[PDB]
Design an enzyme around this catalytic site. Structure first.
Site, mmCIF file in Angstrom:
data_model
loop_
_atom_site.group_PDB
_atom_site.id
_atom_site.type_symbol
_atom_site.label_atom_id
_atom_site.label_comp_id
_atom_site.label_asym_id
_atom_site.label_seq_id
_atom_site.Cartn_x
_atom_site.Cartn_y
_atom_site.Cartn_z
ATOM 1 N N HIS A 105 -1.859 32.470 -39.916
ATOM 2 C CA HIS A 105 -1.075 31.315 -40.394
ATOM 3 C C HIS A 105 0.264 31.282 -39.647
ATOM 4 C CE1 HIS A 105 -3.860 30.555 -43.676
ATOM 5 N NE2 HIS A 105 -3.777 31.818 -44.071
ATOM 6 N N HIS A 115 -9.077 31.037 -37.792
ATOM 7 C CA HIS A 115 -9.933 32.049 -38.417
ATOM 8 C C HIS A 115 -11.025 32.433 -37.436
ATOM 9 C CE1 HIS A 115 -13.890 32.557 -40.605
ATOM 10 N NE2 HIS A 115 -13.236 33.617 -41.067
ATOM 11 N N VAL A 118 -16.631 38.324 -36.474
ATOM 12 C CA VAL A 118 -17.854 38.770 -35.789
ATOM 13 C C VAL A 118 -18.341 40.008 -36.527
ATOM 14 C CG1 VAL A 118 -17.609 37.788 -33.447
ATOM 15 C CG2 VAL A 118 -16.405 39.942 -34.073
ATOM 16 N N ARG A 119 -19.654 40.076 -36.804
ATOM 17 C CA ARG A 119 -20.141 41.163 -37.642
ATOM 18 C C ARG A 119 -21.614 41.427 -37.399
ATOM 19 N NH1 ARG A 119 -19.828 36.545 -40.569
ATOM 20 N NH2 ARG A 119 -21.672 35.922 -41.788
ATOM 21 N N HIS A 184 -15.111 18.872 -53.096
ATOM 22 C CA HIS A 184 -14.368 18.114 -54.113
ATOM 23 C C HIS A 184 -13.244 17.269 -53.532
ATOM 24 C CE1 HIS A 184 -12.060 21.903 -53.995
ATOM 25 N NE2 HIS A 184 -11.001 21.158 -54.306
ATOM 26 N N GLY A 268 -15.177 44.196 -54.260
ATOM 27 C CA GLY A 268 -14.734 44.491 -52.911
ATOM 28 C C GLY A 268 -13.243 44.832 -52.882
ATOM 29 N N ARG A 269 -12.723 45.014 -51.666
ATOM 30 C CA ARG A 269 -11.323 45.433 -51.531
ATOM 31 C C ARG A 269 -10.460 44.175 -51.619
ATOM 32 N NH1 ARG A 269 -7.109 47.165 -47.895
ATOM 33 N NH2 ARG A 269 -6.188 49.155 -48.554
#
Lengths: 312, 307
Positions: A105, A115, A118-119, A184, A268-269
């Protein structure tokens, strides 16, 4: 049959850690070029289930107002029903996942939020070959869009996709538009980029080369946009519009983003998950902007799916 | 035969007058602090029938943002739980009317607060819902006790168990699972209320709605002029991020409205004008900032009823 071997996983891990380092270094050069001193501070952590991660987070910056570039490599025990739906043979396997996720940001409204991710996911069972797939993408979230930057962003994506097939950019560009939609508000989140999941249709090494091209491609495409606008003046009204638009980013991540929601629901964290939220965001009741304004053009033109490159 | 159409009209007149009186009471605090912002009227209609009156104060000196929202509409989509708890409503003409409000003070020494009272009727099967709750930043023990005592006192004529049940329901509902924190210091929460005769239930929502106003105004008066630092402002903005997380991740009314094409700008008036998020902030255990979450944002037996 072998791939990914444990050696393959280690190569992916080393690539991801180096990518995190290089992204932080490139963005930090922008922070310093603007006279800032904030750094992407390292927070290393371990998970009792196994594995851990390296979070790198810059706060209170002069050029990067807030940014996180987040690495993890963990044992996986819960998956969303969709993964097991899309890949039923992972039921009852030992699984691991490794990746880099980032959200940046900028302080100056003239530089978009951005943003990337990669995974790799791998599920291993006795006497079965590994089940694996990659996921990832990058995307651009402007406030005061610049037509040329949108074209250059998409051209960078088109060029990196080209060697993998003449249809790859079109598919992953469309997937990004379909995914990053705020139902929305009837708005796209941004001007898009690439998004993909469940990627295992090419041989393993071709898929790893793709996530390299996507991750490196994010860095090489975002730095020129920083450089172009870093010193560009802006008004208090433009800061207020940026904060108002950041409220839309919070709405997407807390209402629609599958990874965020799954992480919040499954323990999760939390602090690493929610690093994606900006430092400051605004909400107001029924604001109006004039017909010819850049603020209105952001939603009338840029935050709808567009054929930026004129491919169709 | 209750509720008749005359009964619905009595409820509607109560709700509109309650909206007027809440805005007037809070506006008196705005002016007492030197402000000029008002709860501006936005009247709207819905083609399916009915509509609402939204009253929204922005950019105030004492009330930084507040919405006091009335609606009375024909309902066609209901959440799965409503048809599950009341399976006869399937296929009926229905309507719903109520007031909902969220008030975010400028001064961190005054809590954010929320209230709601509403009626649903399917033609009849009917039920009320509502409550009120307090979301502090720099809590004051006496204010928390007075808030809960006001709730206890208004519940008393309806039954010696009513406060205990609606106070527990408030604690259970306003829980942020992913933060393991209560949203606030609680109050009352109830839904599906039709176990007393209709008029007793209507008297209850009157007591709840009037009780919110009578309990919140002394808290404004006590702290309106109380000084605060820039660090306390920053903590208030950080804490407001938790309010946004609750409303966008857990609040059933908000999520249902977003999913089903409700009036998005009215639904999201609950979000504050400004909110902040930061990565891994720490506060010393001796500080009021840490005491907020270690002590106050857990379910507590404020009145000592369970000792």
């Amino acid at each position: 049959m072998q791939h990914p071997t444990s050696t393959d996983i280690q190569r992916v891990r080393e690539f991801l850690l180096d990518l995190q380092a290089r992204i932080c270094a490139g963005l930090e050069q922008q922070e310093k070029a603007g006279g800032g001193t904030a750094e992407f501070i390292i927070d290393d952590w371990e998970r009792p289930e196994g594995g851990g991660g390296r979070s790198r987070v810059l706060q209170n910056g002069t050029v990067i107002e807030k940014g996180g570039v987040m690495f993890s490599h963990i044992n996986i025990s819960k998956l969303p029903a969709s993964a097991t739906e899309r890949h039923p043979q992972i039921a009852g396997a030992k699984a691991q996942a490794l990746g880099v996720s980032l959200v940046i940001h900028p302080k100056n409204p003239n530089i978009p939020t951005s943003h990337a991710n990669v995974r790799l996911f791998v599920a291993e069972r006795e006497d079965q070959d590994p089940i694996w797939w990659f996921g990832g993408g990058f995307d651009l979230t402007p406030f005061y869009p610049d037509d040329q930057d949108v074209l250059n962003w998409h051209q960078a994506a088109y060029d990196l996709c080209k060697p993998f097939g003449d249809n790859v950019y079109a598919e992953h560009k469309k997937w990004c538009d379909d995914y990053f939609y705020l139902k929305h508000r009837d708005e796209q989140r941004g001007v898009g980029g690439l998004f993909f999941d469940d990627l295992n249709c090419w041989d393993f090494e071709t898929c790893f080369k793709y996530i390299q091209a996507v991750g490196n491609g994010y860095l090489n495409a975002i730095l020129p946009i920083f450089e172009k606008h870093r010193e560009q003046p802006y008004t208090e009204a433009q800061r207020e519009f940026q904060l108002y638009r950041r409220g839309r980013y919070v709405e997407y991540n807390l209402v629609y983003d599958r990874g965020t929601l799954f992480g919040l629901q499954t323990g999760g964290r939390i602090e690493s998950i929610l690093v994606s939220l900006p430092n400051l965001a605004a909400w107001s009741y029924r604001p109006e902007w004039d017909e010819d304004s850049p603020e209105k053009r952001l939603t009338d033109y840029y935050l709808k799916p567009r054929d930026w490159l004129g491919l169709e």
